[PDB]
Amino acid sequence: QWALEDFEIGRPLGKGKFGNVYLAREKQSKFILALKVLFKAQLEKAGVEHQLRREVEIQSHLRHPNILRLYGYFHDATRVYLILEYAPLGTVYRELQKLSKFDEQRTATYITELANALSYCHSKRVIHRDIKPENLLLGSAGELKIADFGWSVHAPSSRAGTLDYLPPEMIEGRMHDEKVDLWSLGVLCYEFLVGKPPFEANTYQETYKRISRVEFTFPDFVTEGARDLISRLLKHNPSQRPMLREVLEHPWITANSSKPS
Ligand SMILES: Nc1ncnc2c1ncn2[C@@H]1O[C@H](COP(=O)(O)OP(=O)(O)O)[C@@H](O)[C@H]1O
Ligand SMILES: [NH3+]Cc1ccccc1N1CCC(CO)CC1
Ligand SMILES: [Mg+2]
Ligand SMILES: [Mg+2]
């Protein structure tokens, strides 16, 4: 049904590995949306057809205020097009670059919105596996929305870029489950408060070392409550990481967040 002819294309919203994402408006309805463009030659070369299929099937069926909607797709012999909800206030990544660090209230609020969306995902046994600031978008009221389900799957499971958000079991090629998303949640909470992720390093090889050893320290300004939560999430043993419910009910979260479970 849908074809390129049905849309007017506007400015670039962002660039991805395969993805090149544009603002667009549907001609008959004037509906404003985002069009994620992937080149088939690059998809075929990388051999990532299967995860593109996953992205469409999993994201199109999820329904949650804190998850970005996917409406449909089409393709045209050189390109695939994913039709997405437009997020008008951009990425959390850009916001972090602008402010350098978030305060505790802004951080706890984002963590609550994230944990709500992840709780909904895990109840359907969907694990996201690529939670990071460039994949977190902001709606018209500044609410957080998880996007980019290009690495998502069903659990249990086995398995090019940054190691910074991945847990030890995943970077060691081992087996993993839902608890990978709780680790990434810990990494994010730290990066929000401090301005850089806790295992950041100059080379791949050494980042790998800091992650497998769980080697991180806190700057003085990080408070006791934040330290307690982050320390609970960044556990080497997956089974020792908390349930999302315990994250949403953590004293530091409840004291500082401006949104409910
Ligand atoms: N719906 C959207 N609204 C606004 N900006 C978006 C939207 N989707 C993607 N972007 C921008 O484009 C970038 C790449 O999108 P993404 O779907 O994450 O591609 P990739 O799978 O290649 O990472 C994002 O980091 C963001 O800057
Ligand atoms: N049919 C489009 C296409 C072209 C080239 C490579 C992969 C793909 N898909 C990804 C999306 C899938 C949704 O069903 C269909 C297969
Ligand atoms: Mg992305
Ligand atoms: Mg992707």
Side-chain angles (χ1 to χ4, degrees), residues 1-14 16 18-27 29-44 46-93 95-208 210-223 225-244 246-258 260-261:
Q1 60 179 304
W2 289 122
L4 188 62
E5 63 184 343
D6 295 312
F7 303 91
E8 293 178 324
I9 316 301
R11 70 145 174 113
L13 290 173
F18 309 83
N20 302 84
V21 186
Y22 299 87
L23 189 67
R25 187 179 60 168
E26 199 279 306
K27 282 179 180 177
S29 64
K30 310 192 207 179
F31 198 92
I32 288 282
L33 48 92
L35 229 48
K36 173 174 181 168
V37 182
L38 307 112
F39 285 102
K40 280 177 177 182
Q42 273 167 288
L43 293 174
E44 182 176 271
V48 298
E49 298 96 336
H50 64 286
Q51 65 174 33
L52 191 45
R53 197 146 15 224
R54 258 162 188 172
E55 183 170 359
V56 172
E57 278 178 1
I58 293 175
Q59 192 172 178
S60 68
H61 294 54
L62 296 173
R63 301 291 163 91
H64 194 282
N66 298 113
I67 304 177
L68 193 84
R69 284 283 299 128
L70 180 148
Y71 297 125
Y73 77 94
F74 56 98
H75 52 294
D76 80 339
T78 48
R79 291 175 289 276
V80 189
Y81 308 80
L82 308 201
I83 303 176
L84 306 173
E85 173 187 359
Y86 165 51
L89 301 214
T91 66
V92 170
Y93 178 93
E95 197 74 3
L96 195 56
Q97 289 199 307
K98 183 175 76 187
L99 301 177
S100 300
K101 305 170 300 152
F102 300 156
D103 58 34
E104 292 197 304
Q105 294 80 19
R106 181 182 199 99
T107 298
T109 298
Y110 284 161
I111 295 295
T112 296
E113 296 176 302
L114 251 183
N116 282 337
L118 286 176
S119 201
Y120 175 84
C121 285
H122 291 178
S123 77
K124 311 186 171 308
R125 287 228 83 182
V126 165
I127 68 202
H128 185 277
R129 305 196 309 186
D130 201 17
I131 299 293
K132 65 184 169 212
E134 315 93 273
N135 286 341
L136 300 175
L137 312 180
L138 299 162
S140 67
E143 75 276 25
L144 182 144
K145 290 172 190 282
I146 302 179
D148 194 356
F149 277 77
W151 265 103
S152 73
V153 292
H154 282 70
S157 203
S158 197
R159 110 166 162 171
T162 175
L163 292 189
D164 278 304
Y165 303 93
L166 303 178
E169 64 268 25
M170 203 161 141
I171 312 189
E172 294 172 0
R174 290 153 47 202
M175 306 234 168
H176 57 271
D177 58 13
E178 275 93 341
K179 293 295 187 184
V180 300
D181 286 337
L182 280 106
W183 173 279
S184 296
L185 195 61
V187 174
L188 219 44
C189 189
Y190 185 102
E191 184 177 11
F192 288 169
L193 291 165
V194 176
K196 59 189 196 296
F199 309 109
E200 179 161 65
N202 264 306
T203 81
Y204 180 106
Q205 285 87 353
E206 155 207 25
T207 296
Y208 182 103
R210 292 188 79 206
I211 294 171
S212 57
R213 293 162 186 194
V214 200
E215 186 187 309
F216 73 95
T217 60
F218 298 106
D220 290 335
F221 62 83
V222 180
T223 68
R227 297 187 186 222
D228 187 80
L229 177 57
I230 290 166
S231 288
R232 287 185 189 263
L233 295 164
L234 302 179
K235 294 287 190 190
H236 187 272
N237 186 345
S239 51
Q240 298 194 305
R241 300 173 204 152
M243 295 274 164
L244 285 161
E246 308 169 61
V247 177
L248 291 153
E249 288 170 354
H250 188 283
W252 181 80
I253 290 293
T254 57
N256 289 286
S257 170
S258 58
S261 317

